[PDB]
Symmetry: C3
Subunit: 114 residues, 3 copies
């Protein structure tokens, strides 16, 4: 699993523990060891959401499996909660695109997971 957040929140507003918190929470949510989880936060972005430049986030969650209708609804609550508390983003200004990756289409360690 790989989680990416793109936001107009300033860099100084991103807590130093946020990547570790996300790692850990996503391990619990997906049932995967934290070692497998990658997280990426991109602050200071030129963005608008609904025509407004109030705090917002455009995010992606990729996983080989563990993606689906009910799971994604659950992830949205987890992730909106974390973004709300730690980045002070309203949950209605967050989009999360979910990608169920085929193992043959994820490279790692000189090969793929297939």
């Amino acid at each position: 699993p790989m989680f990416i957040v793109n936001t107009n929140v300033p860099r100084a507003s991103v807590p130093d523990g946020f990547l570790s918190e996300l790692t850990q929470q996503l391990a619990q949510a997906t049932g995967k060891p934290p070692q497998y989880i990658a997280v990426h936060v991109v602050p200071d972005q030129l963005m608008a959401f609904g025509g407004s430049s109030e705090p917002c986030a455009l995010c992606s969650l990729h996983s080989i499996g563990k993606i689906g209708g009910a799971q994604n609804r659950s992830y949205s609550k987890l992730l909106c909660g974390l973004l709300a508390e730690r980045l002070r983003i309203s949950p209605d200004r967050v989009y999360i695109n979910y990608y169920d990756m085929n193992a043959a289409n994820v490279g790692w360690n000189n090969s793929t997971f297939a």
Copy 2:
């Protein structure tokens, strides 16, 4: 709909009003209300297109529906036209990836759109 532009054009070259213009032009193109539209512009990027560092862009349009053969041609004309007029990027140094997202795979406000 969510539109992202990644470009090597410098930040000072992005006009005031660009994000608003994109929002408005996308609302017209897609028929979706501007409240649901997100736009994200990322200048000053280390990029090459065709081995050259002349102005270029790599973009993405995600939408739940409103993606398809003729629609995407229309969008490419619109969006390359904006990049050319506003950012002075040649249309032949732009790629736009189009993604027709399943509503179950788009999270927003503590749920998905399914």
Copy 3:
């Protein structure tokens, strides 16, 4: 084909010529002309892999075809090798997401491909 690498290594760690090399090597690997190859390198990112901040990368390769089981293994070996030799990123701290794009879903030069 379009290749994007996001990394926590610093910009000064990216060697002169890296985007050229990537262009060249990807042309060789995909068989596509270099003119159509786009590369994008994003250093100095706020990242974690497995909860560690040691050098890592999150990458994407998009191509209209030339994506598949064996191909992707080959590309992973290539690209992990480059990131290791050039950017001193361990291969086991790189993920590469591969995307086989439908030509109708790729915009370029005011239109889309087929």
